[model samples]
Target: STTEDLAKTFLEKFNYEAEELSYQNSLASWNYNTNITDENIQKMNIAGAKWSAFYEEESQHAKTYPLEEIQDPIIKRQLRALQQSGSSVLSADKRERLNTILNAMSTIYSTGKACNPNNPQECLLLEPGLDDIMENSKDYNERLWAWEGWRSEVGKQLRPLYEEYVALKNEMARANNYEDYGDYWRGDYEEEWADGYNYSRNQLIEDVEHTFTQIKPLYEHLHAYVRAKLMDAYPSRISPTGCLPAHLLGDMWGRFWTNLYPLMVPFGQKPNIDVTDAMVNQSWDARRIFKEAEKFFVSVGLPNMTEGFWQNSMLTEPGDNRKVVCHPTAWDLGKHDFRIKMCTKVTMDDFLTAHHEMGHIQYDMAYAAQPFLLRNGANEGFHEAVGEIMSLSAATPNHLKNIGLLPPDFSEDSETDINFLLKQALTIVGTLPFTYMLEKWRWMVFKGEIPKEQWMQKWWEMKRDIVGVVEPLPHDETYCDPAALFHVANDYSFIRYYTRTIYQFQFQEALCQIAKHEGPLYKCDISNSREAGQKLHEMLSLGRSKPWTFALERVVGAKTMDVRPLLNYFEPLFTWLKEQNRNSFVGWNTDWSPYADHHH
Candidate 1:
């Protein structure tokens, strides 16, 4: 057969098989997550194995074709998708072993609990128990106990499993002709085929470093101000001239400082930005929260959810006794079969989260016309960035007031504006370096730059140097501290988050300009703007058919990720933080290591 004829035949078979397997796997996985029964787990694993077999067969068939002779970009992209599909070349035994280790690690993380030393009978699960202590507890000792307890129980158990996991994944990467597993992950963001755009793994690293440098000063300013406030709140426990202790930074991992908004708010008398009480007082339920998010999308000229969406989605926890995963995720089981699974609450956080998750469904719907291979985001970061753009708008006080979550008379004064910006920074700006450092360490580990013996020591050193946060005490190789995080244990790439943080702001600025809004970039809301929606829809419809830079240029008018828009959005807050920290230290002393006690 000719190259063009062969390509057409290959795609016809590939698409049919791909769609069938996707629907089967999504359904099986959904059943397992919602029921958590032994039968459901077995069914899910069977479905996964079948999918893996299909990918392996199809990938080998794709390699038989002469891709260099193919002139059609669409065909090239489709074939490439098959070629790179999920550890495709691993032997059956190795693949099964990898899956076993991955499943075991994930189970350990989800079911792990910690008991207090003072009261051994009262143990706490990670969700509402230890997470509550991490978020709300002001007692330094209690927070420390929960933090250390989780590492002792969960982290120590995963050390050996993770070591094996890394080795198997690296072997799979070598079979696929990648330098390492980290390089294979980075391949998602770049195209290496003939006549493709010029993007390399090294270029990705440079872009990340450049963007982090652009935004690091803002993070440093926020850190200095937060450290000063924490010093006053914890007295002798917090250092005046050193990094903030990790346990005391509002959460177990210090990924977000949002829970510390109460301690760090510049003005105490202003009305708080959180509207959970108002949402509750108004009797908003899970259905209402989703309805409101739906209305926002429809107002911006997006398609309405189909009847199947409402019929199939698990919007709230079932009243009947059953075990279910409560993590919020949007599902595209098949064409016109989109759904969201979450145990939602009538809280401001969930309210914003509804908008974010719904954004994923919107993207899925927008690209439903594409072939199976191209039915995803231009890259993983684009999908997350799309969702975050919705959240950025939904979080604005103006949007909240319009939605009646905030009082109609609510106004933004100087003090209230600072309060709002500070709260936004706590989540958005605070998470950048955390995401960056975690991925950086993982990349180093995957590339064998860091020896196995020094993993924990190097992890904390980078955390303190890059994120300006330190562990409560020293940790040795016996502890796999990074694996305690859900992403690390669950085997997900972390740098998508870092890229999404930058991409969201760039997207927001473009949409805001299209909406013709005035005033600060942070305050601009693109609600009810068909022009902005049309532009976003056009870009999303391209899906993964083209290079991500092509899709990015279609909407943002830029071919590269830029941090200027993010800085512009937070310019007012950056100025305020600098003034607040004028008399205090602005950066950390990198010499103050988290492993100081152990090393000495």
Candidate 2:
């Protein structure tokens, strides 16, 4: 009883201090995003170091108290507190060093701007401009340039520092009690939430990979269609013989390939309403756009965004730097403060992104009622999956119509369904392999399987091997393109996105099942269903207090995280894609092979 009391008391104080520090850090981050300066940079560094120290202390306490010795129910919960703690065991000096490294990386991460040499302003790869070109620019060369403008700067400029960050991370993980950083990370997830189901990492990976294989033939056909449509773009780089040129698909890595929907238009036209254009014409500001999301969530019976959240959120980028992360993110600054920060635009892209980011904030609010140690998702996948599940609903055509975003009479025929599925498949289903490979690549690099000299070489190898996408231009030691994405440079786990993409569909299916959805899962809008909403609320309210299994079971009626629902939901789309791709090339171009580029 004393042990439970002591643990609770310690965590209460820890929670209060942690929340205050987090609030300060969130403010610092907002400032840094707006205008990177010495004062702001120092503010982040100090806050980060303090935060690290607090967690490290708790972790050490967990190591000291073997929760196994105590059999009390209350005390049994104490072990979970330790289990929930982070794995970053570090000396104070090293923690401080990490603060400096991350702060330094922020500028590189923040500074993606459009190419405008005429103005000669700072140009990294910012969105709106870059994203517009990638989506709409008919000129292959211009599209390539826009893609390059972002990728060229980050990887080419900061190779040394980025490599330094990786080395330090590996060293830190080894000191923390793991074979390596990757092992420690995977092991940490297993230790926290895999035993009851007896799920292994390999099993999880295999399940996802199997789904990837099942859907891969459709991807191959789409790749061939795009190649034929954009043959000119591939003359210099890709061949029907070689790999598909990565840049030609309208993104750096061609993850979603949503932008390529124009050429692949089965109906020979775009959607009934250009939501992107319509939003701009209506002066749909971020605030107004967000209100729609708020209503949708509330209608579904979830909690509303707090007034404080609206007041504190920095929705648009500041006027000063004219540049910021641009990437949308949610923030929970302890109690009463929850918000989102992003450089938003009046387009479908941000509409989906806004819902996705807002989902994170909603999750934060739901769990705010929990004690400090218990405020987390069942696992990282659950944390990320909740928001993504909402985004999928928001993106569904039926939901859009139900919310009055689309017309009452708006309906789809056969061609329309094919078009919709093709576009959706590219993004939702098409992106899974790319996400998994991001995780696999890092794990390989973290474990010291990839040598320093083979950095770029191995990057290309993995892309071709896992994603079936290849670089258009020749490059050597001079570039490391993966760092262009914030996850790789910042050393965050990229696998959760992959997992969420799978699990969200599964979660959505379960929610739909509860709602007694009669139609296709894609059209199943669980909106305004108090039954579905209550389940979501119940699961989310538990936060990380119990094992993820408990939270998952509370809502989905399953203790194990499986991808069966994912496959079931997408079955119709897969069957349709198979019919469409029947006569098309179902594999790589016969002439193209990775061996053709052995010169590197």
Candidate 3:
């Protein structure tokens, strides 16, 4: 057969099997996530193992093709997709074992509960229990108890399984001809064309470091200001010059300091940005929240949610006696079936999350016409970034007022602006380092740079140094603290969040410019701007047919990810924070240790 014939033949058969397996896997996985039961889990495992087997077989078949002879770009991309598919390439038995371990870890995370020491009968699930305490409890001891309880219960339990996971994943990567699992993950961003436009894994590391360095100073200023506020709120528990206590940072893992906005708001007299009370008072339910998000997309001329979306989605928690994964996720189950599964609450956070998750659906819908292999984001981060772009507008005070969530009299002034920017920083800027450090640690672990014995030690050291947060108590190898995070436990690559943070602002700036938005980049809401939406649509329609750089250029005219837009958006806040911290320490003292025996 001619090379073109061979490629066409392979893809035609490949797409048919791919579509069937994908739908089956999505259905089984959706069943498990929506109703966590032993039977559902087994079904999910079997479906997932079969999917992996198919990928492994196809990837090997793709390797036999002569890559140099393939002339069509579409064919080359499809072949590359097959070659790069699946994280594991192992024997059937080993592959099944890996799937079992992954499912077990996720089940442990979903069902884990932490009980208060004072009242043993008063146990709380990670969602409402520990989540509430971490967000609302001002008592240092109570917050510590919840934090410690979660790590001990969840992280401690995942330790052995996580170690096994690491070994099996690394072995699979080796079998697939990658250096390590980290190398495999990093390959998502790499591109090597015949004409020599190569983006290497080493280049990704360099790019990440470059961007972090650009944003680190802003993070430091925010950190110092927040630390001062925390000290005032918690009395002497917080140190003047040391890193922050992990538990006191307002959530598990301290990934976001958004809950701390109350204490750290620049002005106390301003109206609250959190419209949870108003949303609840207005009788907004999960469906209402989702409808609001859909309205925003439609107003901007994006596609509306399909009939299957409303008919099939589990927008809220089930009333019956069934365990479900409450984590928000957008699913594309093939054949124009898209849905979101989240136990939505009447809160501002969930409101923004509804927009974010729906953005994923919108992206999926935009590229629905693409070939099966080219239907994903140009890269993993692009999907996340696109989702977050909607959130940037959704969270703005202008949008809130327009939607009647905020009072009509509410207007943006200097004080309100700073307050708004600070709150935004708490979520966006605050989480950057946490994302960076976590991924960096995992990459090192996969590369054998951090030995098993030193995992916990190096983990804390990096957290304290890079993230400026410390463990509430000393931890040993008995605890796999990193796995306590949802992304780590579920085996999702986390650098996507960090990169998405950068890309969202770049996208926002572009969209705002197209809308002829006049004002600070932070205040620009692209809602109802069909021009901006059309540009976005053009790029989204490209899907993964071309390189991510090509899609990015189509929208933003930039072939590379840039941090200037993000920095520009936060420039005013950075200035304000620097002035606020003029008399205070702007950095941390890394002399503290999270290991009991280490005398740093």
Candidate 4:
């Protein structure tokens, strides 16, 4: 059927011209919304070959194809090849191939999400498919919450192999692709490769290396019973039908399934408040909310949220902006229950809750209002930078009061204000570099020369090198469960937030400075800055409507792509951490750095 449809869609539209849309993609012309590329739109492209559903194989067969025209790095060149490569079975020589691919499948997702959930600005791309996977699995995860019959049955069926596969690929997952000479650097995998470069990080190598370090805790934590069972059931039973690879397939252990938002979408692509919309409209079912929000307390899979977009965007009638489906979601949003779905303490902190999603919502709404133009992030970092500013702002003492985090008569002057600002700042600023380092390491694994599962060791090495965040940071046995959480992979596309989050903090700092000195960062505001939320809407209204660089300059006055804000944010906390480490009072690693750039 796919072949027939592919041929039909191809031959039927050979000479068709791209045109404007009257409604959803349903009415767009053949060439209008189809994947076919014309000479005019060819040059400014971001779409790589969609080989997932194409070859009908297990691993990507496209990786072995040709790709020399591109100019980025060898790893990207090979990655394109692998993405496009035909799937391979566990051959005598390539049996370990499955291991590497599987590890990639399992580890990449979680790492990618953590890379920027706190600091979304530094990221560069948005992996829609990854988000789709996590969103799709909401029901499955919800069932797990109830300890239903199917949950255990699914686990019994999918766990054993999951365990072996995770342990098998640990080395490859954490190594620089350039240095991992064994698994990722095979001669048979050579290619004329290209793509995956356009909006990637500047320090792609180090980013990949560092991400491995970040994931070490997660991998070491989840490597035992949970993953082994999944491995045991692999190839014997298909992963919950919802397990079809979204971004890239053959990623074993279902890594992409959980960390969907971070996997397929780049860190610095566009602005969306899919999360915000979900909250405002309460569009999701309980099960999904349970899985992403409740089970893991992660929520990157939300969809279609845009700024200033009230439910009116898709409605037959008018309604409040917070209670409508501003955009479509990766999963069926209507079924999700935002409350009580996530297992983690659903922090009412505005940044983690409403305002955070609102940042994306405004961006999406603004983008939908204007079109004929889809803008890329100045880098992956822009999305998080823009998204977080709104979220972080919402996390403020003022926001908490508005959202009911305070008593009826409470105000910022009510003893808890500094803690609010300081807490959010720490969350935003302190974790920024950790995300960058994680992504840097991920890219490097595909770049050149490490062995399988080398990511584990390299991860520890990075702790010493980059953040000085040393080892023993809790990879406790409880972490070995493969089905426990989603693992997002940055590959070459996802780290824009690696840089984007820092940029976001820079943006946040600049905006706060403007608001504190010159009044609200917006033109119109209630005396309380409640109305300044519109200023965020104004920023999102710009969307990918402008070149990311130009748009950012307009918003923050200067790109200020430096480390000062990050360093400044970490200062007090870093000192405290070191003191605890020195006193041996702290149970975890307490590394520190001067990090001068974060301040000045």
The candidate scoring highest on TM-score is 1
Query: What's the candidate order when arranged by decreasing TM-score?
Result: 1, 3, 2, 4
Model 4 Cα RMSD, Å? 17.2
Clashing pairs in 2: 112-124, 112-125, 112-126, 113-124, 113-125, 113-126, 241-591, 241-592, 242-592
Candidate 2: where is the Cα deviation over 4 Å?
1-8, 23-63, 70-167, 192-211, 232-238, 274-292, 307-329, 340-358, 395-397, 400-405, 473-479, 589-600
Candidate lDDT values, in order: 0.88, 0.69, 0.89, 0.34
- Tell me the deviation in Å of residue 550 in model 4: 2.2
TM-score, cand. 3: 0.87
Error of 2 at 398 (Å): 3.5
Clash pairs (backbone) in predicted model 3: none
TM-score pick, better of 1 and 4: 1
What's the candidate order when arranged by decreasing lDDT?
3, 1, 2, 4
Tens-digit lDDT track of model 1 for 1-600? 788679778888988898999789999998887788999999999999999788778887887777786778788888877766565468899999999999999999889889999999989888879899999999988999899999987899999999998899999988878899899889878865433454787788889999999989999999999989998888876666677888988888998999999997799888767889989999999999999999999888898888988998999988687889999999988756899999999998899999999999999998898999899998889999999899888888889899888889976788888898998899989999999999999999999999899999999899988999888878899999999999999999999888888888989999999999899998998998999999999989998887888888889998778999999999999999999998999988755533352212
What does candidate 3's lDDT look like per residue over 1-600, in tens digits? 897778779988998898999889999999999999999989999999999888789888887777688888889888877766464458889989999999999999989988889999998889777888988898989999899999887889999999999999999888878899999889889876734445787788988999899989999999999999999999967777888989998887798999999887788897656899999899999889999999999988998899999999999999797888999999999878899999999999999999999999999999999989899998888898998888889998889999999899986688888888898899899999999999999999999999889989999999989998978798899889999989889999989888888888989999999988898899889998989999999989888888887788888998778999999999999999999999999998877533332324
Query: Candidate 3: misplaced stretches above 4 Å?
Result: 24-57, 85-88, 91-129, 149-161, 194-197, 273-295, 304-329, 340-354, 400-410, 476-479, 593-600
Steric clash pairs (candidate 1): none
**Index of the highest-lDDT prediction:** 3
